[model samples]
Target: TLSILVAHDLQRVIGFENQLPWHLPNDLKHVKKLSTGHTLVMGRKTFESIGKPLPNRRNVVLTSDTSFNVEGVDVIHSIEDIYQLPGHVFIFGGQTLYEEMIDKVDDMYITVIEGKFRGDTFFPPYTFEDWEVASSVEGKLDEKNTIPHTFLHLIRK
Candidate 1:
């Protein structure tokens, strides 16, 4: 079954400084939990945003530019390259890849934050009547603050 795990953190909130300087312990910990030992397919920008390879996962960086270079990343020019990945592969995104992979997804893991944050980047429209939300979390990030976040697991129909 094809599965493209979906996620978004507008403002790139988890990223700041020359590194991920905000809420990162929680963010990396969560990402490691979700993707470690699995393959990670993402656009070149996402790969660069992270700055380095995440240990223990195969990194597939998709770029239309034929000359892009990064050590240890397998640069792929098309979706066909990702289709050949071994075992439980998932696409990470920067909007464009999300749009491209939307129709091919089977299950999604979306972390929905409570506040509206500004950014030049954003999530694509998430609409699929056949898809179903399976779980959610609340009162996350802070207890005193009602600003909540939910992890929504959706399975395509």
Candidate 2:
């Protein structure tokens, strides 16, 4: 099964200066739960932002730069090659990659943060017309963060 995991604020902003705009550990844990033991597909910038391959998951990076290399990280030079990839894959990303794969996604796991944030990048615009809400749960808050958030599981209809 292929799934896309994303966390964005009310404005659909996902990042600022190549980093997450907010620190929500619960959302991080939600990502970990869904991505572990699966193939994680991301753009070069997204992989760089993470610094290294996530443990217990296969990391595949889409990069137009043929010279880019990282130990233990699979690099695909074209998005076309992504369609040929096998197994359970999760398209995790920076803005451009998400936009590229939006139509190809089978399912989406979204963490909707309640507030707006200042960011230079945002998730691609999408509508609920082609998807159905499979499940949702209110996220818990912790110290250093009090923003309300919900985990939404959406499946393509």
Candidate 3:
């Protein structure tokens, strides 16, 4: 099934200056846990933000710029090219990718974080009422993970 996996603050801000606005290991841990054996489809900006392809997972970057190429990652020009891709592909994003895939995905896996984050990029606005919360897990504030967060698995209804 298709899905989206991301950690965003209350403002729906995901990143700043092509980097994460905060350092939260638990958020990273969750992403790794679910993404390890699967494919991650991301936009060029998100791919650049991540710097390198995440190990143990197949990385696909979507961009209109055909000249943009990176080692160890698949590059696609259109969403239609990715429609036939196999397995539990997570649509990683910046802005356009999410907007392009929002109506087509079957699920959304998100981490709702509690913190004041300063970011230049924001998650694309979506209507969650049409989605049913399939599962949810709340994380306690700890030393390494300083902020309170809740991971929600939402399935399209």
Error of 3 at 41 (Å): 0.6
Residue 52, candidate 2: how far off, in angstroms? 1.1
lDDT of each: 0.68, 0.90, 0.87
Instruction: TM-score each candidate.
Output: 0.81, 0.95, 0.94
Candidate 3: tens digits of C-alpha lDDT, residues 1-157: 7898888899999888988888789888899999998999998888887789999998999889969888899888888977878888999886777888888988899999988788888888877688998989998788898889999998888
Candidate 1 vs candidate 3: the lDDT winner is: 3
Ranking by TM-score: 2, 3, 1
lDDT of 1: 0.68
lDDT per residue (tens digit) for residues 1-157 in model 1: 4566544553333223323222423444566888988888888878888788888888889999989887778788988787777788877766678778877877887765555554556666767586897876542464443445566778987
Q: All predictions: root-mean-square deviation over Cα? A: 3.7, 1.1, 1.2
> Top model by lDDT, which number?
2
Q: Which pairs clash (backbone N, Cα, C closer than 3 Å) in model 3?
A: none
- Rate residue 75 of model 3 by lDDT: 86
Tens-digit per-residue lDDT, 29-142, candidate 2: 888888888899999999998898999988999988978989979999998887788888888998998898888889999999999999998999889998899999999877
Count of backbone clashes, every candidate in sequence: 0, 0, 0
How many clashing residue pairs, candidate 2? Answer: 0
